[PDB]
RNA sequence: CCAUAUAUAUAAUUUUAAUUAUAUAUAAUUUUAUAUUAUUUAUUAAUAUAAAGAAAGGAAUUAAGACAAAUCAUAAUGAUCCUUAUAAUAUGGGUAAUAGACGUGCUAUAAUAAAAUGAUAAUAAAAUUAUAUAAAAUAUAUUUAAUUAUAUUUAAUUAAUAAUAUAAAACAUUUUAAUUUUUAAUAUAUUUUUUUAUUAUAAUAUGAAUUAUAAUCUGAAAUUCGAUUAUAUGAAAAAA
């Protein structure tokens, strides 16, 4: 029931997996970058983050490129190779 | 420590297991050419071996890593049956036969 | 690796000197393959026979 | 007539798949080695140990001889009924009135059966 | 049961129908009366080696009511009479894999208990490396600081000690700590121990904030260091982990693994093993415990001088700096030797007796035999793989 | 060659004495038929894991306990097409396997080796859903005897 | 067929590249210089 | 004739795998002694027991009919046809287009099963390298190293010598959604990698098609139309 921007996760969710399977633009590198980034260790889990721990998470989730901007992206470059 | 400079120099083509510098040269077209080369090059890494007066190869330690993977492509059968366990008594113990003694004696 | 690069370096350079060998650290695409590598003209020439036969 | 070595050695040389074996076989307390290897680091598996040592068993000499096997070839298991096909064929030359029994338990007879096109 | 195999014998309670019988109880003073012969810990022994973790899963204690070992004369008396009789009492245990390292480090802390010592044990290192317990950074400890670890070990070395030993010993100097505590959390925000008038057990019952149990840890070990009332033995089991691990698998801000001496368990560890923090009273020792579930580098050969350096080791396979610092304090190895034939027939005795032996194997089989069999099916003497041979061998 | 004593005195004594089995034929099969891909290993851990806490939870002979349930859980003589046919040991071992993994499968451990070993506990403490199917074969078997 | 290797104890004591040269000094090359 | 088991010869055991290699030769279609049941009744079969046995498998090798053939690409000869064309050369394209339809295989749909790791290197066979193979090392992905892929450079070997190439499953530890069967805070314990108590806590961390970015390999040339790497994507697939 752990929400960030709009997406939910489970508490038993690992943090450096959920992030990666439930936004666009992160994978698994970038949701260990992230992580790493943000002191939380390895295995962390949802249920255990704070509030502001959540909140710096969409912080940082926010500043990179990903969901509607990555998505128009993709589509953009699409359309410019039908063109 | 001119041997020791040139077994560094000589990289792979040195093997410290059997102590050996092994050269092969086939790029001239006749095979006397390239006993010429070979023989050059003996007298080069020789020649600057023997110089030590601006050279300084000591604390480099021998690299044997090429050795190391040409011996593990390599089966081995370094054991050898246990000393104690021989046991002499119960060897075969030739028998007296009087028939060969009065034909030789 | 405990051993410094500087040492590794001049052992490279100079035994790639001793035995008639170029030494490229920086390592660009000279593309010195090309020159060593081996011709294969005349034996794709000689697939079919010599062409100087009886007839 | 196959005899003892002059260290009292019983040498004998089996096969099984691919794999083959020779084996010196001494009297002593037990022990065996394989490749210069405990029998427990160089086999795994229990099933091998127990093929190797059951000609020891059937003759109820088991504890009574020292073993150095020496394998090469094939897998785990061929490697190690090549040995106890070796054990046998050893064991034969200290008692050769124990090669009927050990020739009814069935480690005296090589397993022919191999891989096939 | 809902656990795996091994997490079901080990948590499962299947001890609870194993035979009540009665063994002779393990002293070392004693070790004549019970050389070579299988005893029982003592009632108070199993407490304090519990707590310590001594005991182990896959060791196949499931059998017995209690936990039980065979007081070796080339294993348990050879290793217990250096460790009580050489200048210098470091000692790293190496074997083959399952020749019973654990066993005889269980074995080293019973002694310990029997002569008053407190005991500090870590018992699988990889928890505090494996990165699934939480971790931060500390500036005044320039040092990483793991608090789950840390308040769990904490209070393993309370319990698993007596309080008797840990009153005793006291503070050198004031120590004061934030408070989490409920009563005195909120009404007072700090804790404040004195010297000479508060003790040691005072500060292995300190609740301090996560981050604040950094200084907590450090404290301790500082303070059972320069003390000499009590001999202090640390312990270390399944230790090549930590050496065939240099690195662990936490991250710093900028994705670079961290260092294992950057984190403080790694350092408190090393720096004991290296000899840089001196335990004082002389009697204090060192035992690490090798094994066979982790990987083999030349670190630990060449630390205890079997091979020669081969400085063209990649950093995997080598790592110097643990060398040089195994090799600053000065660490001898003891290898444990394996069971030779009559321990086997000791072994295989008590397990007959134990009615965990099966029906072919008791029924029907010369008894000599049968000692040639197992014998041989062991490894010529691997307690394990004895005993998978009698217990896990149905065929 | 003239045996000497010590060899003579070995060929009286074993000769005096049976052969050993090389293996449990009843272990074996279930083995054989715990395998797939040819990992027999596999099958032996399992199966000696099972048995493991079968003597862990009863302090018997777990061995025993096996042959006790395959023998009283199979069925003799089975209705095929309908007149009943006689089982030999094999098929009976093997019905009475599948029957014990039906039941183990049915089990909330997610080790197989756990659920065996618990299922094999209970049907040795005479308690399993096999003894109905067992029945019920032998009722069809009692029902259609007229057909021999 | 045969195959003779002789051992011999003793005491101790290029087309495409000239190819190449040619094309770099012809006038297609060195007029881009 | 293979394979198997042996014997002789050969190898100055550094071309070492003498546990091997290839020449010659031997051996088996197994031989026997009884018991029982059948028997054309023994000088016979079925079995079973005992004894000597290493001895248990395999291929090839002939004609006679009959059908099917032109990627009969399994050919020859002949018949007929083109001879500025149905012959011949070059550039590019196509043989890869998709509403569909059916075969053949590969990858999957999770816990009797997948992933990571396992350096004094767990354990093979048969091959291949003068129109080659590419070792070890250095550098970049990339990060202390390792792994994996390229780049630089060619060490030996033209070979029982060196390389392709440390075989992998196996075995050991750890993790693994569905699963409140889990993790977390306080306590707790003679289960401590763990137990207890109070609160908190249909496609996944299977699958990898498809799509996007940027690099790389061969070749003169990778657009139609090749392979490879990393970073994003993440479909269908569950029951019968
Ligand atoms: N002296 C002994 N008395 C009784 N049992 C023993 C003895 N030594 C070893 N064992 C048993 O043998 C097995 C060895 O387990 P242990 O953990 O001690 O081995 P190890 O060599 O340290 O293994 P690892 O490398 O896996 O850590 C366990 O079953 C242990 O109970
Ligand atoms: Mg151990
Ligand atoms: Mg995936």
Redesign the interface.
């Known amino acids: 029931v752990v929400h960030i921007l709009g997406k939910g996760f489970k508490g038993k969710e690992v943090i450096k997996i959920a992030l990666a399977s439930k936004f666009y633009g992160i994978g698994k590198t970038t949701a ?2 992230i992580c ?2 943000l ?1 939380f ?4 889990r949802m249920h ?1 983050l704070s509030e502001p721990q959540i909140m710096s998470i969409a912080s940082e989730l926010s500043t990179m490129t990903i969901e509607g901007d990555a998505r128009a992206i993709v589509k953009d470059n699409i359309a410019l190779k039908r063109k | 420590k001119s041997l020791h400079k040139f077994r560094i120099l000589a990289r792979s083509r040195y093997d410290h297991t059997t102590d050996i510098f092994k050269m092969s040269s086939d790029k001239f077209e006749h095979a006397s050419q390239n006993a010429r080369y070979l023989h050059d090059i003996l007298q080069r890494l020789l020649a600057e071996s023997k110089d030590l007066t601006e050279d300084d190869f000591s604390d480099v330690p021998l690299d044997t890593r090429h050795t190391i993977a040409k011996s593990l492509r390599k089966k081995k059968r370094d054991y050898e049956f246990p000393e104690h366990w021989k046991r002499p008594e119960d060897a075969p113990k030739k028998k007296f036969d009087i028939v060969d003694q009065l034909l030789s004696t | 690796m405990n051993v410094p690069k500087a040492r590794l370096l001049k052992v490279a350079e100079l035994s790639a000197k001793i035995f008639d060998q170029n030494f490229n650290p920086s390592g660009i695409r000279t593309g010195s393959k090309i020159l060593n590598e081996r011709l294969k003209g005349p034996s794709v020439a000689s697939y079919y026979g010599n062409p100087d036969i009886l007839k | 007539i196959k005899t003892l070595d002059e260290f009292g050695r019983s040498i004998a040389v089996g096969k099984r798949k691919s794999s083959t074996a020779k084996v010196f076989v001494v009297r002593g307390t037990g022990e065996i080695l394989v490749n210069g290897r405990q029998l427990n680091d160089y086999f795994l598996k229990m099933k091998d140990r127990e093929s190797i040592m059951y000609p020891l068993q059937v003759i109820e000499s088991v504890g009574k001889y020292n073993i150095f096997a020496t394998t090469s070839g094939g897998g785990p298991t061929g490697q190690a009924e090549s040995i106890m096909h070796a054990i046998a064929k050893a064991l034969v030359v200290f008692n050769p009135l124990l090669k009927s029994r050990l020739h009814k338990a069935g480690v005296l007879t090589r397993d022919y059966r191999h891989v096939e096109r | 049961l809902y656990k795996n195999w091994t997490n079901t014998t080990h948590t499962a309670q299947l001890q609870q129908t194993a035979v009540p019988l009665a063994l002779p109880i393990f002293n070392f003073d004693d070790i004549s009366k019970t050389l070579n012969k299988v005893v029982s810990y003592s009632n108070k022994q199993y407490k304090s080696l519990h707590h310590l973790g001594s005991f182990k899963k896959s060791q196949f204690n499931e059998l017995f009511q209690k936990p039980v070992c065979l007081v070796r004369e080339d294993a348990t008396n050879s290793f217990l009479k250096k460790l009580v009789s050489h200048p210098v009492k470091k000692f790293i245990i190496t074997g083959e894999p399952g020749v019973g390292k654990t066993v005889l480090l269980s074995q080293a802390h019973a002694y310990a208990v029997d002569s008053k010592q407190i005991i500090i044990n870590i018992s699988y290192p990889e928890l505090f490396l494996n990165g699934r317990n939480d971790f931060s950074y500390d500036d005044d400890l320039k040092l990483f600081i793991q608090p789950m670890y840390l308040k769990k070990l904490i209070r393993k070395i309370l319990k698993a000690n007596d309080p008797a030993l840990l009153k005793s010993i006291e503070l050198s100097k004031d120590y004061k700590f934030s408070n989490a505590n409920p009563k005195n959390a909120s009404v007072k925000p700090f804790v404040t121990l004195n010297k000479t008038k508060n003790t040691v057990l005072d500060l292995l019952s300190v609740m301090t904030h996560p981050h604040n149990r950094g200084k907590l840890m450090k404290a301790i070990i500082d303070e059972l260091s320069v003390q000499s009332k009590v001999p202090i033995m640390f312990t270390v089991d399944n230790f090549s982990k930590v050496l065939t691990t240099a690195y662990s698998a936490y991250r710093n801000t900028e994705n670079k693994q961290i260092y294992s001496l950057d984190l403080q368990m790694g350092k408190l560890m090393m720096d004991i093993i290296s000899g840089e923090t001196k335990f004082a009273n002389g009697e204090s020792s060192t035992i690490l415990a090798i094994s066979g579930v982790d990987r083999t580098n030349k670190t630990l050969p060449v630390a205890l001088g079997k091979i020669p350096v081969d400085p063209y080791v990649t950093r995997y396979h080598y790592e110097p700096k643990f060398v040089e610092l195994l090799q600053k304090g000065n660490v001898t190895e003891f290898e444990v030797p394996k069971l030779n034939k009559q321990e086997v027939n000791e072994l295989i005795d008590y397990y007959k007796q134990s009615n965990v032996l099966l029906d072919k194997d008791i029924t029907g089989k010369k008894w000599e035999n049968l000692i040639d069999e197992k014998y041989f099916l062991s490894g010529n003497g691997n307690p394990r793989e004895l005993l998978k041979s009698l217990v896990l061998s149905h065929r | 060659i003239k045996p000497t004593a010590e060899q003579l005195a070995q060929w009286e004594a074993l000769k005096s004495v049976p052969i050993p089995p090389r293996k449990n034929a009843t272990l074996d099969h279930i083995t054989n038929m715990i395998m797939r891909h040819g990992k027999k290993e596999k099958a032996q851990t399992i199966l000696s894991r099972a048995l493991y806490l079968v003597y862990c939870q009863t302090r018997q002979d777990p061995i025993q306990a096996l042959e006790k349930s395959l023998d009283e859980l199979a069925p003799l003589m089975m209705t095929k097409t309908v007149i009943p046919v006689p089982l030999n040991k094999r098929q009976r071992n093997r019905i009475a396997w599948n029957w014990i993994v039906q039941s183990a499968n049915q089990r909330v451990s997610s080790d197989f080796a756990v659920r065996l070993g618990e299922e094999l506990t209970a049907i040795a403490k005479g308690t399993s859903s096999a003894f109905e199917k067992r029945d019920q074969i032998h009722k069809t078997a009692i029902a259609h005897r007229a057909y021999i | 067929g045969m195959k003779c290797n002789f051992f011999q104890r003793s005491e101790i004591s290029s087309a495409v590249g000239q190819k190449v040269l040619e094309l770099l000094d012809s006038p297609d090359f060195k007029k881009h210089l």
């Not at chain 1, 260790?41 to 962390?44: A, E, I, L, S, V």
Request: proline share 10%; hydrophobic share 20%; charged share 30%.
């Open positions: 260990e970058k790493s980034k002191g260790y390895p295995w962390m255990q």
